[PDB]
Amino acid sequence: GKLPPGPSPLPVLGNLLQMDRKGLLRSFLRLREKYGDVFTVYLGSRPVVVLCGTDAIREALVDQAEAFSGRGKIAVVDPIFQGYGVIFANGERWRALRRFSLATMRDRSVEERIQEEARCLVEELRKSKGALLDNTLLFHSITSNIICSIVFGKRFDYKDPVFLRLLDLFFQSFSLISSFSSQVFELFSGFLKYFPGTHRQIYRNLQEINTFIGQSVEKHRATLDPSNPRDFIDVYLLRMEKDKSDPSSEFHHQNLILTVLSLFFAGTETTSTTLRYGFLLMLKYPHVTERVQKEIEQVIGSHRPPALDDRAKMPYTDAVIHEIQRLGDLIPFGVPHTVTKDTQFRGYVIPKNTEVFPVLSSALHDPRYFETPNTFNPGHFLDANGALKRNEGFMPFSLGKRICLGEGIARTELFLFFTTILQNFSIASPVPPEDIDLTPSGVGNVPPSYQIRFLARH
Ligand code: HEM
Ligand SMILES: OC[C@H]1O[C@H](O[C@H]2[C@H](O)[C@@H](O)[C@H](OCCCCCC3CCCCC3)O[C@@H]2CO)[C@H](O)[C@@H](O)[C@@H]1O
Ligand SMILES: OC[C@H]1O[C@H](O[C@H]2[C@H](O)[C@@H](O)[C@H](OCCCCCC3CCCCC3)O[C@@H]2CO)[C@H](O)[C@@H](O)[C@@H]1O
Ligand SMILES: Fc1ccc([C@@H]2CCNC[C@H]2COc2ccc3c(c2)OCO3)cc1
């Protein structure tokens, strides 16, 4: 057995010279062209196995789900997470935190917090009276507020300057994490960590968030009612007490800080940018947005708030959302995995702990599953009867055991925010549809910034 084929590497520099300067995603797509769907690339001196196309990614993450369930490190944030918290934990630590986190958030429901946030957002947008605005901040705020409501048992006002201060420096961290400079850090951190760069700024920002999280933990502990836990932090503190006699237990303070940080880290920016991309497509394609508001009117009407049960009756809107996520492609080369043991895969052997990237973009644009993969097309998700249809290339949340933990919540946000906004508002912008440019990144693709008006309807 051996590793999947790929370009021969240099000793310190790995496959530096066979990389493309546009970044990792582009580097991977060009190599795929030369080497096939499964290949090995050296990021500095680390071998990394790259998976492209729906079928190879499913063969790994679904057909050998356990083998492929390891988590690989992200150099720019590892000095913060250091293998703690739900995202970056491995083995028994991960299993315990993932089990605990799923059970905890799945119990005012999440749906209800979302409808309340959407109600707050609409009330805020109305105050605009159709003024031009950049919706970036509002979309960061609504999605952060869903996580806040789950973890801290509260939401924050849109104009709260302390919320906004922390929000700003938190979201600044995402742009930085996505930059070319950080991508270079992913390859050569062993050297570059000794010099100034984005990694110090990412570190400082996230540590400052950890400080605030730590203060809210103290405050929760001081006011705790063990009979009536308020939120994720309360429930976790009760688990710490329950496990206090087990010194092997994963429920300690560091896992708590870093699990809370993980939920904001994974659950805010992807959701927010999906919404922002969505509204950019809805300005580019008024006929779609018109059909979505027609379906809203038929199913929901103009008086009551959308509810999640509405989605089953709204295949067209559901299909529009699927297509926004697909074309959005917000995590285009996945989040690194590792194999948890020596692994046979398509006739190659992948040694234990080798890093693997599932290149979700190449599934999202797979021409086997999407007739017009580069064109916005809700028909990709609709059958001949206009009913929603599952699509095997649709894996924006990934697949298998590491599948997005927040998938259910994120989809509920997407549905209720898109539909609650479009129920109450129509949209316009200074840029005619024809000149709207959808090209982003890209460790995470970021849409252009744009101006929009929300025009209150009857
Ligand atoms: C449109 C919005 C979202 C998208 C497309 C998305 C996508 C992803 C992806 C691609 C992964 C990597 C899975 C893998 O390792 O292969 C992931 C992991 C994760 N996601 Fe999401 N996400 C979104 C929103 C959220 C939200 C709202 C939450 C929490 C409320 C969240 C929580 C997490 C967590 C905690 C992990 C680590 C899972 C693990 O390692 O077991 N995500 N998500
Ligand atoms: O002088 C400071 C005053 O502000 C306080 O507000 C608290 C709030 O009660 C408290 O809920 C808040 O917690 C901050 C949690 C950190 C949130 C970080 C996330 C925010 C959303 C985006 C992702 C990151 O911190 C504030 C710190 O001040 C209290 O309102 C006052 O009692 C206090 O006197
Ligand atoms: O990590 C060290 C921290 O120690 C204290 O906080 C601890 C507390 O010392 C520690 O008591 C607490 O664990 C208790 C959590 C739930 C208490 C269980 C109770 C159940 C009812 C019967 C009494 C016990 O965890 C906190 C997490 O920080 C300090 O308050 C913090 O400032 C300090 O950061
Ligand atoms: F589990 C999760 C981990 C990281 C996220 C990030 C959250 C913010 N927006 C970008 C998401 C992906 O970021 C990555 C992707 C691959 C990488 C990378 C960083 O550096 C080199 O290889 C989301 C969920």
From Swiss-Prot:
Subcellular location: Endoplasmic reticulum membrane; Microsome membrane
Its EC number(s): 1.14.14.1
Main location: endoplasmic reticulum
Pfam families reported in the protein's UniProt record: p450
Catalytic activity: an organic molecule + reduced [NADPH--hemoprotein reductase] + O2 = an alcohol + oxidized [NADPH--hemoprotein reductase] + H2O + H(+)
UniProt function note: Cytochromes P450 are a group of heme-thiolate monooxygenases. In liver microsomes, this enzyme is involved in an NADPH-dependent electron transport pathway. It oxidizes a variety of structurally unrelated compounds, including steroids, fatty acids, and xenobiotics. In the epoxidation of arachidonic acid it has a unique preference for the 5,6-olefin.
Listed name of the protein: Cytochrome P450 2B4
Source organism of this protein record: Oryctolagus cuniculus (Rabbit)
